[PDB]
Design an enzyme around this catalytic site. Structure first.
Site, PDB file in Angstrom:
ATOM      1  N   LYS A  44       0.828  -1.195   0.000  1.00 33.84           N
ATOM      2  CA  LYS A  44       0.000   0.000   0.000  1.00 33.84           C
ATOM      3  C   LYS A  44       0.861   1.242   0.000  1.00 33.84           C
ATOM      4  CE  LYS A  44      -3.331   2.937   0.633  1.00 33.84           C
ATOM      5  NZ  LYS A  44      -4.532   3.156  -0.231  1.00 33.84           N
ATOM      6  N   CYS A 131      -2.141   9.765  -6.875  1.00 30.67           N
ATOM      7  CA  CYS A 131      -3.289   9.703  -5.968  1.00 30.67           C
ATOM      8  C   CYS A 131      -4.307  10.822  -6.278  1.00 30.67           C
ATOM      9  CB  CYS A 131      -2.880   9.764  -4.490  1.00 30.67           C
ATOM     10  SG  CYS A 131      -4.318   9.576  -3.375  1.00 30.67           S
TER      11      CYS A 131
HETATM   12  C1  LIG Z   1      -9.374   0.312  -2.908  1.00 28.96           C
HETATM   13  C2  LIG Z   1      -8.394   0.987  -3.816  1.00 28.96           C
HETATM   14  C3  LIG Z   1      -7.223   1.453  -3.234  1.00 28.96           C
HETATM   15  C4  LIG Z   1      -6.156   1.853  -4.027  1.00 28.96           C
HETATM   16  N1  LIG Z   1      -5.001   2.338  -3.448  1.00 28.96           N
HETATM   17  C5  LIG Z   1      -3.916   2.705  -4.235  1.00 28.96           C
HETATM   18  C6  LIG Z   1      -2.724   3.149  -3.666  1.00 28.96           C
HETATM   19  O1  LIG Z   1      -2.455   2.902  -2.474  1.00 28.96           O
HETATM   20  N2  LIG Z   1      -1.682   3.523  -4.518  1.00 28.96           N
HETATM   21  C7  LIG Z   1      -1.810   3.432  -5.893  1.00 28.96           C
HETATM   22  O2  LIG Z   1      -0.882   3.761  -6.625  1.00 28.96           O
HETATM   23  N3  LIG Z   1      -2.983   2.984  -6.448  1.00 28.96           N
HETATM   24  C8  LIG Z   1      -4.026   2.624  -5.626  1.00 28.96           C
HETATM   25  N4  LIG Z   1      -5.188   2.166  -6.209  1.00 28.96           N
HETATM   26  C9  LIG Z   1      -5.320   2.262  -7.701  1.00 28.96           C
HETATM   27  C10 LIG Z   1      -4.933   0.894  -8.255  1.00 28.96           C
HETATM   28  O3  LIG Z   1      -3.576   0.608  -7.946  1.00 28.96           O
HETATM   29  C11 LIG Z   1      -5.125   0.871  -9.764  1.00 28.96           C
HETATM   30  O4  LIG Z   1      -4.293   1.861 -10.352  1.00 28.96           O
HETATM   31  C12 LIG Z   1      -6.572   1.121 -10.213  1.00 28.96           C
HETATM   32  O5  LIG Z   1      -7.501   0.522  -9.342  1.00 28.96           O
HETATM   33  C13 LIG Z   1      -6.764   0.596 -11.631  1.00 28.96           C
HETATM   34  O6  LIG Z   1      -6.589  -0.797 -11.659  1.00 28.96           O
HETATM   35  P1  LIG Z   1      -7.819  -1.824 -11.682  1.00 28.96           P
HETATM   36  O7  LIG Z   1      -8.713  -1.597 -12.885  1.00 28.96           O
HETATM   37  O8  LIG Z   1      -7.288  -3.256 -11.723  1.00 28.96           O
HETATM   38  O9  LIG Z   1      -8.644  -1.549 -10.433  1.00 28.96           O
HETATM   39  C14 LIG Z   1      -6.255   1.774  -5.412  1.00 28.96           C
HETATM   40  C15 LIG Z   1      -7.425   1.299  -5.983  1.00 28.96           C
HETATM   41  C16 LIG Z   1      -8.498   0.910  -5.210  1.00 28.96           C
HETATM   42  C17 LIG Z   1      -9.547   0.086  -5.913  1.00 28.96           C
HETATM   43  O1  LIG Z   2      -5.737   5.485  -1.025  1.00 26.17           O
HETATM   44  C1  LIG Z   2      -6.327   5.925  -2.037  1.00 26.17           C
HETATM   45  O2  LIG Z   2      -7.379   6.609  -1.955  1.00 26.17           O
HETATM   46  C2  LIG Z   2      -5.873   5.759  -3.454  1.00 26.17           C
HETATM   47  C3  LIG Z   2      -4.590   6.064  -3.855  1.00 26.17           C
HETATM   48  C4  LIG Z   2      -4.256   5.964  -5.196  1.00 26.17           C
HETATM   49  O3  LIG Z   2      -3.073   6.223  -5.558  1.00 26.17           O
HETATM   50  N1  LIG Z   2      -5.224   5.603  -6.067  1.00 26.17           N
HETATM   51  C5  LIG Z   2      -6.488   5.332  -5.678  1.00 26.17           C
HETATM   52  O4  LIG Z   2      -7.386   4.989  -6.506  1.00 26.17           O
HETATM   53  N2  LIG Z   2      -6.793   5.410  -4.375  1.00 26.17           N
END
Ligand SMILES: Cc1cc2nc3c(=O)[nH]c(=O)nc-3n(C[C@H](O)[C@H](O)[C@H](O)COP(=O)(O)O)c2cc1C
Ligand SMILES: O=C(O)c1cc(=O)[nH]c(=O)[nH]1
Ligand SMILES: Cc1cc2nc3c(=O)[nH]c(=O)nc-3n(C[C@H](O)[C@H](O)[C@H](O)COP(=O)(O)O)c2cc1C
Ligand SMILES: O=C(O)c1cc(=O)[nH]c(=O)[nH]1
Ligand SMILES: [Br-]
Ligand SMILES: [Br-]
Ligand SMILES: [Br-]
Ligand SMILES: [Br-]
Ligand SMILES: [Br-]
Ligand SMILES: [Br-]
Lengths: 313, 312
Positions: A44, A131
């Protein structure tokens, strides 16, 4: 037949890992990712101090994906560093840590702390510059001046090969401007495309209310929503950044979508929303499915088709 | 009941085509006028006829559409003649979309429109968000360029008009865009949003992109863009209280139109669904929106426009 990937001074068993933020906040999350069939895993996005995040509800699952405004809830950089230093079984798979300072100075402080652990254990850094969910802190990657400042100071402070989590772009001029900045920094060895589509809005018609509490309902979109956006960004940077790898993130629910990411240029493939829906058992399925599609098409390795998407131009 | 009274006009219902869908030829515009739609808008036009980008340049998708048309159109003279001579204004009001590839072209075009707006009441939507012409990026993503377009068009046209905005994904850009728009009072409506620019769709069967132009890169519409559209509508609704917002993106049903309106939309535009289904969709949309309103006890659109609830 091989799903192996050899990059960044590591051998990966397969190209799959979790997307930062999904199933990687707590020690148990990380233990379950390590036990999974994933080729790797990423922690994370952390901050210097433990961080509590935005008010709940801050995640909502949708038929075509997800919307979130978590607000970077995490255990603090020291927890992740100790996990990487002592706990993580590196004989199982390599480990990335995501770091997301809300300022240059905070990110610099965390990457300084990572240096000895990267030297000790080979822990890889992904710097989050995308973010969309911290009120008042807009996506760093949408400001090229600010992005340049981060990359300079982090390159200086960390001094080791690292990666960047980019926000999605939607404008050819912006692919060009972003690449130019990125190409000025040789320690950026990989580019992760992409983070969520920022500041979407989902509304419940029955109670006429937004589905998440933070920011008047405005949240990052992932899942089926982002696949064509994610592929465009992977390929755009694949073409513009000759001496960097690109990691694909967005819309992967299957081997066939993983295949498309690899075709577009992706070295590793990150799974967010689908993993949130399904749990870490998804990685066994993804390996089987990608292997099967390769067999069908007569491919024996990923580099037989990585970046080989065909155009009609 | 479904009526809308804005811009010096009465509309029977809030629905119209999105610019570029079913609105290039006279027959297209006839069919839109014959439809149950509240309004209609012409294809984004250029001063001279344009052939557009090579084919395939539209590809229909389970969750929407990807397109790189490249502004194929019959040239401004045709749309101006349609507006002055052919269109039946007893049926419904008419919008024309104008998409000069330079300010100078846009200025030339809007000058021709002036007498026709004064005589027939034809409405201008200025396109500031074409993502499909190489070397000509979305004007709306450069707030300096956008201010100059708005200034020169305000001077040249001098009458109430609207703008087709690209989708923004960054609160800072909502704030900047709205601040630029709020400096031009002649901008009376804001259409949110144009296609999500420069996505890429690849067919796994043949390992080939699905459209020819720009190595496969095109604008996304349909189910992909609903949250983006709704967010943009509501962002501008909140930031531009002395203007109107038109919603565009992801409308396949009365439920999605209800959401657009709840987010702040006055009119609701339909692109992809219409490309899929044809002009008969408008009769369905009127019926579905009414059904939702009766179930909730709304008798008019203004009883719920912009009244989306939040938890903070
Ligand atoms: C619950 C949630 C939390 C996330 N937290 C982060 C984060 O800590 N840092 C980050 O770079 N991306 C975070 N993401 C974004 C994901 O890494 C990813 O870029 C985004 O969900 C697109 O991928 P997906 O279609 O497989 O969901 C988060 C996404 C979600 C769904
Ligand atoms: O912690 C989050 O809200 C978060 C971070 C991030 O980089 N991307 C995202 O979709 N959520
Ligand atoms: C085939 C095609 C052509 C389009 N041409 C135009 C155009 O001329 N001008 C414009 O402002 N938008 C144009 N659009 C964008 C739409 O007007 C609309 O903003 C977008 O498609 C999203 O709405 P939707 O989800 O209902 O499709 C076009 C879209 C497609 C599908
Ligand atoms: O003609 C096009 O390609 C076109 C123009 C526009 O404004 N939006 C779109 O999606 N396509
Ligand atoms: Br902000
Ligand atoms: Br563009
Ligand atoms: Br197959
Ligand atoms: Br007016
Ligand atoms: Br460009
Ligand atoms: Br934006």
């Amino acid at each position: 037949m091989s799903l192996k990937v050899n990059i960044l001074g590591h051998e990966f068993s397969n190209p799959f890992m979790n997307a930062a933020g999904v199933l990687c906040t707590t020690e148990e999350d990380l233990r379950r990712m390590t036990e999974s069939e994933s080729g790797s895993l990423i922690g994370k996005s952390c901050t210097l101090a433990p961080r509590t995040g935005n008010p709940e509800p801050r995640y909502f699952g949708l038929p075509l994906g997800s919307i979130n405004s978590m607000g970077l809830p995490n255990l603090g950089v020291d927890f992740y560093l100790s996990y990487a230093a002592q706990t993580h079984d590196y004989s199982r798979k390599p480990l990335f840590l995501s770091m997301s300072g809300l300022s240059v100075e905070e990110s610099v402080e965390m990457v300084k702390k990572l240096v000895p652990i990267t030297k000790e254990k080979g822990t890889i850094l992904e710097l989050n510059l995308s973010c969309p969910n911290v009120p008042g802190k807009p996506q760093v990657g949408y400001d090229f001046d600010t992005t340049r400042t981060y990359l300079q100071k982090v390159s200086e402070a960390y001094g080791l090969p690292f990666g960047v989590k980019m926000p999605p772009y939607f404008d050819i001029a912006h692919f060009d401007m972003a690449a130019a900045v990125l190409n000025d920094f040789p320690l950026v060895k990989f580019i992760t495309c992409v983070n969520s589509i920022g500041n979407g809005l989902v509304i419940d018609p029955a109670n006429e209310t937004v589905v998440i509490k933070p920011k008047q309902g405005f949240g990052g979109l992932g899942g089926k929503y982002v696949l064509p956006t994610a592929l465009a960004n992977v390929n755009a940077f694949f073409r513009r950044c000759p001496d960097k790898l690109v990691f694909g993130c967005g819309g992967v629910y299957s081997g066939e979508e993983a295949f498309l990411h690899i075709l577009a240029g992706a070295s590793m493939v990150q799974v967010g929303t689908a993993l949130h829906d399904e749990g870490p058992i998804i990685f066994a399925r993804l390996n089987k499915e990608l292997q099967e599609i390769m067999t069908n098409k007569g491919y024996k390795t990923l580099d037989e088709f990585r970046g080989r998407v065909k155009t009609m131009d």
